[PDB]
Ligand binder design. Structure first.
Ligand SMILES: *[C@@H]1O[C@H](CO)[C@@H](O[C@@H]2O[C@H](CO)[C@@H](O[C@@H]3O[C@H](CO[C@H]4O[C@H](CO)[C@@H](O)[C@H](O[C@H]5O[C@H](CO)[C@@H](O)[C@H](O)[C@@H]5O[C@H]5O[C@H](CO)[C@@H](O)[C@H](O)[C@@H]5O)[C@@H]4O)[C@@H](O)[C@H](O[C@H]4O[C@H](CO)[C@@H](O)[C@H](O)[C@@H]4O[C@H]4O[C@H](CO)[C@@H](O)[C@H](O)[C@@H]4O)[C@@H]3O)[C@H](O)[C@H]2NC(C)=O)[C@H](O)[C@H]1NC(C)=O
Ligand SMILES: O=C(OCc1ccc(OC(F)(F)F)c(F)c1)N1CCc2cc(C(=O)N3CCc4[nH]nnc4C3)nn2CC1
Ligand SMILES: [Ca+2]
Ligand SMILES: [Ca+2]
Ligand SMILES: [Cl-]
Ligand code: NA
Ligand code: NA
Ligand code: NA
Ligand SMILES: [Zn+2]
Length: 806
């Protein structure tokens, strides 16, 4: 109950929320059905509309008006945004040439440049080019400020997960808003778009920007707007807040538009009905910028124009139905649409089996438009697993499609022509970023980046220390004129050992064999140097990775490759090698097919053994440095060392062998040499972070050889590809992957065919940032380059998406 008989007199859009049953006057009171009786009358005035006219100029103040054209309005902070244009002969902001803003130009008493976040729902990245004719205000922000060709949203590419990611810097799995709809099994409560439960604070994890600001003594406007408050009123409220006394005036503000998303759902992303919504958004931006100019704030405020996600063409007829796959359809609950999430309808049903459900949904129809996954097998780049609100069974739905349980769900629950929620690498889901103000750069284009990075930057803009988050602080320093964040490289925690020859062959009883006993100061002085690290400069181009946790490991040097070998996990944490454009692929000689060789630098007790692999009927092995790429027949013996060996299922060896035999050479040809760092990843609890030894759920049968959940590779070359990878004077180019180490290839419906028809497609799906690999390994790469650290952090956050041009 609310005692709605209080009054909003002088309280309109109050910044502090009053505790019920006292009636409210803040911009959210409508949503809670809690506004005072006179809120509409006093706070949502519409009389005379939103614009000054020639004859309204100089008028006598009439408090009933929506905005004012009287002489006193500027000091009152409540003129219509076009007052000075109409009445004082000013130009609109958009008609003014842009001029570099080298310093904040602010009224006296402003302690810092305010930040205004202008967020647009469903604003697809290609609207910037495609709608540019009808968006002159936005086009001026974009060309005069700092802009990216697009910004990558988080998965799922829905509204709430993305807006909350913008506010927190966290993946949805960490912030807890994992969809627009959710069931939390611990609360036993459901979260929905409509309804009351979503207002409960227990759903919302991490620390959003307005809380970060408040705690650190920076005042914030209220970020959320009830839908029925028109856009013109949102703008005038912000402009009014900016006229408050110094001690009361917020420093950070947000505006939200439900457009163009709202019309996009109805008409598709490029429906002819989409032009009007883009015009209206531009007009709103114009109103803000005119209002700012009037207040002498247009060269003071930093403005961010940002979207939550794009919009794709999707129609009713493009729906897959689980009823065409499952016999047991009524025993499941599906969260439907542009993603699928499945759980048991009843926790009392002991005959529910996720394994049989997954199998029934796997590669069943020729052009099947969704792929089922256990959540821990989803591409690691989605970071979509580590939350109890994410169901074990997930469906990744093809762009342009929906999944639903039964046909009746679609026509008894065509309306829409657009939707979103798909994989966050999909071009149509990409959204926008523009930064304009004294703190952003002038007329600068920056590369695409992820929206998880923005929280840090908004903190930088306000002089705040960011709460712990998933951005990489410093990676967006190149967007900023000043207020950059200058991080230091993390300190290495464990130093390596550098073992020499310490064991005789006969001390090893590993069950391993090799036809290598076939016999000189030319070549023996030479081989000793290689084992002391003489070629290390060629194969370790960016310094050795730093180990950021406590462990015991050895550096092992070889002619063709260098490794950091873990005595704890009994295999390399990383193996580094360079393959020049000129390098040649050779085969594994017949006599060496099953050769595994003891490493006389590493004790038997810290080695793998071949007997375990023989005994384990499910597990085989592969090598991190590929024997195919040995520099000479004698160097090839090094690739068969037991310390270069790692556990691999036969199904996975198909993937790995093709990558090593074919793909590495291909990238070296195309990229003018590559440097490759490969290694294992252990993430049994799917938290995106390196597992400790006591977290490993699987070993090679009868041994302490732990089985990786994933295998990574980081592939680096010169951005200027006229320079060879090992002789690069400037910026680097990277692509990486984190391949799931699976005992079957069920994920690839074409896997019965030649590796050339399905393996590269698998790898592209499992594309990754170096940063993702750092989290998963506790390693820190690119420690020794001639590049600035900020540039390297940008490089580490890069994602190669394999999408065509936006
Ligand atoms: C992306 O960035 C984020 C932010 O940096 C990273 O997430 C952090 O990861 C940390 C390392 O895992 C984690 O640290 C743990 O915190 C525990 C206390 O956490 C509470 O307090 C913080 C601070 O205010 C708060 O943020 C947390 O909020 C979480 O939980 C609530 C309620 O569930 C949610 O509302 C909220 O959304 C958020 O949930 C998310 O995180 C939790 C994990 O905390 C997940 O379970 C959820 O799925 C969701 O993703 C909390 O309110 C602290 O107790 C931990 O310490 C235990 O574990 C360590 C192991 O190192 C051990 O040393 C300790 O002894 C202790 O163990 C004891 O408890 C164990 C479990 O009960 C038990 O097994 C043992 O036997 C012991 O009894 C730990 O320090 C930190 O909380 C999160 N922060 C956030 C915001 O998520 C994230 O890793 C980044 N991702 C990537 C890929 O880089
Ligand atoms: O005013 C608001 O939010 C401001 C804001 C702006 C920016 C924020 O973060 C930032 F500041 F960091 F950017 C930041 F948290 C918060 N909101 C939240 C967004 C929202 C969603 C809906 C909604 O019902 N749908 C969404 C579109 C859609 N598509 N398909 N189905 C749907 C259903 N209504 N609203 C209005 C109230
Ligand atoms: Ca949205
Ligand atoms: Ca882990
Ligand atoms: Cl959802
Ligand atoms: Na031998
Ligand atoms: Na085996
Ligand atoms: Na298959
Ligand atoms: Zn939408």
């Amino acid at each position: 109950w609310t005692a709605t008989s209080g009054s909003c007199k002088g309280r309109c859009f109050e910044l502090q929320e009053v505790g019920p049953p006292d009636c409210r006057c803040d911009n959210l009171c409508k949503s809670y059905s809690s506004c005072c009786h006179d809120f509409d009358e006093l706070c949502l005035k519409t009389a005379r509309g939103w614009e000054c006219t020639k004859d309204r100029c100089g008028e006598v103040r009439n408090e009933e008006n929506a905005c004012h054209c009287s002489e006193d309005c500027l000091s009152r902070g409540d003129c219509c945004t076009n007052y000075q244009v109409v009445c004082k002969g000013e130009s609109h902001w958009v008609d003014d040439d842009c001029e570099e803003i080298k310093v904040p130009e602010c009224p006296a008493g402003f302690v810092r440049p305010p930040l205004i976040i202008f967020s647009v729902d469903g604003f697809r990245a290609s609207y910037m080019k495609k709608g540019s004719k009808v968006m002159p205000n936005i086009e001026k922000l974009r060309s005069c400020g700092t802009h990216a060709p697009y910004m990558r949203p988080v998965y799922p590419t829905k509204t709430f997960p993305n807006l909350y990611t913008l506010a927190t810097g966290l993946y949805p799995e960490s912030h807890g808003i994992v969809g627009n709809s959710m069931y939390d099994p611990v609360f036993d409560a459901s979260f929905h778009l409509r309804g009351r439960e979503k207002f409960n604070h227990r759903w919302w994890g991490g620390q959003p920007l307005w809380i970060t600001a408040t705690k650190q003594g920076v005042r914030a406007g209220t970020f959320f707007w009830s839908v029925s408050i028109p856009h013109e009123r949102r703008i005038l409220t912000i402009l009014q807040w900016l006229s408050l006394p110094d001690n009361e005036r917020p420093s950070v503000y947000a505006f939200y538009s439900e457009q163009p998303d709202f019309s996009g759902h109805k008409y598709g992303p490029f429906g002819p009905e989409m032009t009007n919504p883009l015009r209206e958004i531009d007009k709103t931006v114009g109103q803000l910028m005119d209002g700012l100019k009037q207040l002498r704030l247009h060269r003071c405020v930093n403005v961010i124009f940002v979207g939550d996600h794009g919009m794709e063409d999707v129609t009713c007829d493009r729906t897959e139905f689980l009823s065409n796959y499952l016999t047991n359809v009524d025993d499941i609950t599906l969260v439907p649409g542009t993603l699928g999430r499945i759980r048991a309808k009843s926790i009392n049903n002991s005959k529910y089996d996720p394994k049989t459900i997954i199998a029934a949904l796997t590669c069943k129809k020729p052009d099947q438009h969704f792929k089922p996954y256990m959540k821990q097998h989803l591409p690691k780049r989605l970071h979509y697993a580590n939350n109890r609100r994410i169901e074990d069974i997930h469906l990744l739905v093809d762009r342009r499609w929906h999944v639903a349980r039964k046909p009746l769900d679609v026509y008894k629950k065509c309306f829409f022509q657009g939707d979103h929620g798909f994989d966050n690498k999909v071009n149509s889901m990409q959204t926008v970023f523009v930064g304009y103000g004294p703190t952003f750069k002038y007329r600068t284009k920056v590369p695409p980046f992820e929206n998880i990075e923005l929280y840090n930057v908004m903190c930088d803009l306000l002089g705040l220390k960011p709460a712990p988050n998933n951005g990489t602080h410093g990676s967006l320093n190149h967007l900023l004129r000043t207020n950059t964040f200058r991080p230091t490289m993390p300190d290495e925690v464990s130093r390596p050992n550098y073992p020499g020859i310490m064991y005789l062959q006969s001390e090893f009883d590993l069950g391993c064999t090799c036809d290598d006993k076939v016999e000189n100061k030319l070549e023996e002085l030479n081989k000793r140097l290689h084992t002391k690290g003489s070629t290390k400069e060629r194969h370790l181009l960016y310094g050795r990775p730093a180990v950021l946790y406590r462990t015991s490991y050895d550096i092992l040097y070889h002619t063709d490759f260098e490794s950091g070998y873990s005595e704890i996990f009994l295999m390399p944490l990383w193996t580094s090698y360079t393959i020049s454009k000129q390098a040649e692929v050779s085969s594994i000689p017949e006599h060496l097919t099953n050769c595994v060789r003891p490493d006389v630098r590493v004790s038997p007790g810290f080695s793998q053994n071949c007997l375990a692999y023989k005994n384990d009927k499910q597990m085989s092995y592969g090598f991190l440095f590929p024997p195919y790429l040995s520099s000479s027949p004698e160097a090839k013996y090094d690739a068969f060392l037991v310390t270069n060996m790692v556990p691999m299922y036969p199904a996975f060896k198909r993937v790995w062998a093709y990558f090593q035999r074919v793909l590495v050479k291909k990238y070296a040809s195309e990229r003018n040499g590559v440097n490759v760092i490969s290694g294992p990843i252990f993430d049994y609890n799917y938290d995106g972070l390196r597992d400790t030894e006591d977290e490993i759920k699987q070993y090679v049968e009868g041994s302490s050889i732990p089985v990786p959940t994933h295998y990574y590779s980081i592939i680096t070359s010169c951005l200027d590809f006229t320079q060879p990878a090992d002789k690069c004077d400037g910026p680097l180019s990277v692509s990486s992957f984190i391949l799931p180490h699976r005992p079957d290839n069920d994920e690839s419906c074409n896997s019965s065919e030649d590796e050339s028809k399905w393996v590269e497609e698998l790898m592209k799906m499992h594309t990754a940032r170096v940063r993702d690999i750092e989290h998963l390994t506790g390693l820190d790469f690119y420690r020794k380059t001639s590049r600035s650290y900020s540039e390297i952090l940008t490089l580490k956050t890069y994602l190669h998406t394999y999408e065509s041009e936006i």
